[PDB]
């Protein structure tokens, strides 16, 4: 019946690059028309804060308003497991709605990042697959990119993180490049972002072995 | 309000091994108590069939019955895209409920299966990762297993299928073995089941390269 609140973490890579600006987004839906006005309270670890930016309310094609409040989080605060509560109040609910969010909890484990060259049997086609193996990481939040002399290789696909038998995650990234490039001798680098890396970043280069 | 019908495909590997017995399962839920009796109709491509086996009805801890009907499908019929309709009738619904199911549609593409040996940089620890790369397959339904001299290696994890830039899927399987075994010279084989393989099966062996 009453409104419903949803609270969304920042983008993983906004949290891992200190130059970016991570945000937590509080969304209330099913805002009626009779009792439309809603109040946001915000708390960082149970202490009230006032720097949130609420958006002007919008009307939905089901006879309902939508109101979003955005709060910037600090890079260190997010990574240090600080907890972000959004309180939503409306003279229509029996009581207020509270939703709390933080970064995935758990002891962090630093990834091991490995590059693997094409298979022997695959050395037949004109396009080949370059493999990044990333293993032993925790939490599951991660980002992977491939690059070659400055520019980005964007012909890649990365698997979702897979929960591994020790409680850590792994994944693979597959870079597809024209084979002549592999033989020419191009440098290809898989670059990984994860909290548990030094400065949340590492790079591994792959090359035609002599 | 009325009952709800759900219709479930067979297990992927039941469909890929001709010795097994795939089944489609029709589940109706929200069966009331006042109007409890339900009738299953079944059709293979719009033609009625009578070999389904309905289970004796069970009562749910929300004041509702659950009734399941199971229909065996033929191996060839399933793989040839035959369509399986379950009709559910009850003197309580404004009208009957029909749900139709078949194998994932689309032109089949045969996987390319590749085994990759541990990374140079990973050759430091006492456990190593063996990689099966399976690529270019369609539909996404697939099964992967590792084995060594007869017995199954069960210390493996396989990624979900990832949709690749050409419309085909890929995935990787990661076999973890003690490093001494890699150096001793053990044969390790990744065995893949997919519709588009000859007899829905192939095998690729991986060994310490000399
Ligand atoms: C009236 O219409 C209302 C909507 O208006 C309309 O517009 C459309 C939605 C359309 O569908 C029309 O219906 C209509 O015209 C409608 O409101 C809707 O209600 C639903 C439920 O009642 C809501 O469903 C929830 O959705 C969540 C995900 O929503 C995201 O994804 C969808 C698309 O996939 C999208 O529509 C949403 O906008 C939202 O997108 C995300 O938005 C945030 C904020 O912008 C982004 O994050 C930010 O991104 C920016 C840059 O964009 C930047 O990166 C910031 O840093 C960052 O913060 C995301 O990027 C963005 N994602 C995407 C993909 O775009 C679901 O998670 C939620 O699931 C929950 O409940 C499920 C069961 O329903 C359950 O399965 C699930 O577990 C989950 O439960 C919670 O969550 C945890 C799991 O994650 C659990 O562990 C917990 O148990 C539980 N939480 C707790 C503690 O309780 C759910 O499905 C729907 O979002 C909402 N629609 C909108 C638009 O808000 C309303 O219902 C209608 N009225 C009536 C009468 O019904
Ligand atoms: C009263 O209580 C009822 C239940 O009794 C109780 O028991 C529990 C369920 C408990 O939760 C208690 O609540 C209660 O005590 C309750 O009924 C429930 O209603 C729900 C919806 O109203 C149903 O939800 C649906 O579930 C589907 C998946 O269900 C499977 O998985 C769950 C566990 O994850 C499990 O509980 C189910 O039993 C079922 O398991 C699968 O079962 C089949 C059959 O056995 C197996 O297949 C067979 O397996 C055998 C060997 O086991 C062999 O291999 C055979 O070959 C093979 O056939 C599976 O192996 C098995 N899986 C698992 C993991 O065990 C969801 O898919 C479904 O989603 C649909 O709707 C969603 C939104 O709700 C939507 O997101 C989604 O897209 C989807 O929509 C359809 O599907 C397509 C996507 O796949 C879409 O493309 C289509 O658009 C759409 N279809 C179309 C064409 O319309 C949904 O969530 C719930 O299952 C049901 N509970 C049970 C137990 O049946 C009832 O609601 C209560 N009453 C009231 C008043 O509410
Ligand atoms: Zn304030
Ligand atoms: Zn807390
Ligand atoms: Zn380090
Ligand atoms: Zn930092
Ligand atoms: Zn009959
Ligand atoms: Zn049809
Ligand atoms: Zn073949
Ligand atoms: Zn066959």
């Amino acid at each position: 019946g009453g409104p419903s609140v949803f609270l969304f973490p920042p983008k993983p890579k906004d949290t891992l690059m200190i130059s970016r600006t991570p945000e937590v987004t509080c969304v209330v839906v099913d805002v009626s028309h009779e009792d439309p006005e809603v109040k946001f309270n915000w708390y960082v670890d149970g202490v009230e804060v006032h720097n949130a930016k609420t958006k002007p309310r919008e009307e939905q094609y089901n006879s309902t308003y939508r109101v979003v409040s955005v709060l910037t989080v600090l890079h260190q605060d997010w990574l240090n497991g600080k907890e972000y509560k959004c309180k939503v109040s409306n003279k229509a609910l029996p009581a207020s709605i509270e939703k709390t969010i933080s970064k995935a909890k758990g002891q962090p484990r630093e990834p091991q990042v490995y590059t693997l060259p094409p298979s022997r049997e695959e050395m037949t086609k004109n396009q080949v697959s370059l493999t990044c193996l990333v293993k032993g990481f925790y939490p599951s939040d991660i980002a992977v990119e491939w690059e070659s002399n400055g520019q980005p290789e964007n012909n890649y696909k990365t698997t979702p993180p897979v929960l591994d038998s020790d409680g850590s995650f792994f994944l693979y990234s597959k870079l597809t490049v024209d084979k002549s490039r592999w033989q020419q001798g191009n440098v290809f680098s898989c670059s990984v972002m994860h909290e548990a890396l030094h400065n949340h970043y590492t790079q591994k280069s792959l090359s035609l072995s002599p």
Side-chain angles (χ1 to χ4, degrees), chain A:
Chain A
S4 282
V5 182
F6 294 98
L7 186 64
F8 298 91
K11 277 317 155 196
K13 86 175 298 182
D14 276 341
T15 81
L16 300 165
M17 288 169 72
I18 195 174
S19 87
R20 304 189 165 214
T21 326
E23 291 151 15
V24 168
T25 303
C26 198
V27 169
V28 211
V29 281
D30 289 343
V31 173
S32 84
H33 291 253
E34 332 268 341
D35 312 310
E37 323 301 335
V38 194
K39 197 182 59 184
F40 289 95
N41 305 179
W42 284 98
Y43 310 84
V44 174
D45 278 325
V47 181
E48 209 177 326
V49 318
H50 307 285
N51 64 319
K53 292 279 169 295
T54 318
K55 321 300 132 185
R57 56 168 152 122
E58 317 185 82
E59 203 195 343
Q60 311 293 304
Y61 279 70
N62 51 353
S63 306
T64 238
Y65 307 81
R66 177 162 186 274
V67 212
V68 174
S69 200
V70 179
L71 185 74
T72 295
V73 304
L74 295 166
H75 168 90
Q76 65 271 25
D77 286 2
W78 185 254
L79 285 179
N80 284 327
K82 292 211 175 199
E83 287 191 292
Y84 300 84
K85 190 172 62 188
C86 178
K87 208 180 205 197
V88 164
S89 274
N90 193 26
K91 335 182 194 206
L93 283 151
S96 277
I97 319 174
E98 288 177 357
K99 286 279 186 282
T100 295
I101 200 127
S102 67
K103 186 191 75 62
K105 283 171 189 157
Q107 286 286 336
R109 309 192 214 175
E110 194 207 317
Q112 305 135 50
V113 175
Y114 305 119
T115 52
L116 327 193
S119 190
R120 181 93 180 202
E121 346 149 22
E122 190 191 28
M123 286 278 85
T124 297
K125 337 284 170 166
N126 43 69
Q127 282 186 124
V128 292
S129 304
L130 302 183
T131 302
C132 206
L133 171 54
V134 191
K135 80 166 223 130
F137 67 95
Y138 199 92
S140 69
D141 317 304
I142 190 158
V144 193
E145 249 201 281
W146 288 82
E147 280 141 288
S148 207
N149 26 83
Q151 281 312 262
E153 306 297 311
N154 280 323
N155 199 24
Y156 70 85
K157 284 292 164 178
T158 307
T159 76
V162 188
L163 173 80
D164 209 343
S165 63
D166 63 10
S168 77
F169 295 88
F170 71 100
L171 79 247
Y172 296 77
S173 192
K174 183 162 78 47
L175 178 72
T176 298
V177 291
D178 293 355
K179 187 179 190 187
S180 37
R181 268 174 256 236
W182 180 242
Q183 291 161 348
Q184 287 180 324
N186 262 58
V187 163
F188 285 110
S189 70
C190 161
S191 76
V192 180
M193 311 198 62
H194 188 275
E195 74 164 64
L197 294 158
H198 176 80
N199 298 140
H200 328 305
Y201 188 78
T202 200
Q203 200 167 94
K204 298 287 169 173
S205 275
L206 186 64
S207 267
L208 189 45
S209 191

